[PDB]
Design a protein around this ligand. Sequence first.
Ligand SMILES: [Ca+2]
Ligand SMILES: [Cl-]
Ligand SMILES: [Fe+3]
Ligand code: NA
Ligand code: NA
Ligand code: NA
Lengths: 115, 115, 115
Amino acid sequence: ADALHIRFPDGAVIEYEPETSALTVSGIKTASVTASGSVTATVPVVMVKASTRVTLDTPEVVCTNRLITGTLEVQKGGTMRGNIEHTGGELSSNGKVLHTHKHPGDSGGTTGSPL
Amino acid sequence: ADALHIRFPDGAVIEYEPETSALTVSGIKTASVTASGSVTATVPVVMVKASTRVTLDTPEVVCTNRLITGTLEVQKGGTMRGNIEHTGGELSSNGKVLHTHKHPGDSGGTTGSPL
Amino acid sequence: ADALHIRFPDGAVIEYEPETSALTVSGIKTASVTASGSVTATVPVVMVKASTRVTLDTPEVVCTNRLITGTLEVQKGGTMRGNIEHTGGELSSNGKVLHTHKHPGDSGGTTGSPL
Ligand SMILES: [Ca+2]
Ligand SMILES: [Cl-]
Ligand SMILES: [Fe+3]
Ligand code: NA
Ligand code: NA
Ligand code: NA
């Protein structure tokens, strides 16, 4: 056909509105999509507003350019290439702080912090 | 109308079940959505269970709060702010290990590792 | 029923093609899905091709295994565990470079860079 406009007894909406070219699904509890090949979305802007969590349960997540986050937790290691510029706190490894650490010196005293 | 309940000859299902408020798409090979503006999902929990890969092919991925990963690979650099606490292995740069590295000292010997 | 094949006056397509088991939504401007519980996608490959941005506006994004990115920006700190191997530039914290930094030594001179 030529239309999609559904109002359900639970208050859900599933429709397409060609005047504004808007596909709307609202008022549902769950959605799922199960496919054997691929799911693709091609659009300038993707917004996911998830008040609990977004889980990407996969061997690999690839971000092709920039990734921005508030906090980061890495569990099992990694690699980094390129200039990595840390500021605004301490970058420590096993308690040793990059910008402030000292060493025993070579003649019995202590070095200063990094120059 | 008021219902959406489709069973296809390939075994796929596309339906909405208002008793449980559940939208189900199953038994398909591929899905795609192509839009000129935006795609938005607003829901407490998003689960993506992808046995091969999730690719976010975009100039920028933004996580507004926490990001947790198993391993991390950064290809082209970055910035970090705030306290970054590494433990449980070596944090190295060009082979130099933050928590264990030593230097030639200022009078001919070698420093100890970081205090 | 047993079919889903819609052509709209704006040129949009919403259909399922059982010959190839392909669900297609195309030629739209916006889509949104609003749910009170969860949205789940289970499929080997997820592709998001977003010419402006992907935003995960959530307390927590979890990648269960590998995360790969071009650049990284961490705004508010974090933790890292496991071996983290940086190469191919400078890893600095508050201007102090892991692989090249020096210290005042313990007898009035300057240390060398890391061994
Ligand atoms: Ca000395
Ligand atoms: Cl010294
Ligand atoms: Fe040092
Ligand atoms: Na530490
Ligand atoms: Na290294
Ligand atoms: Na720095």
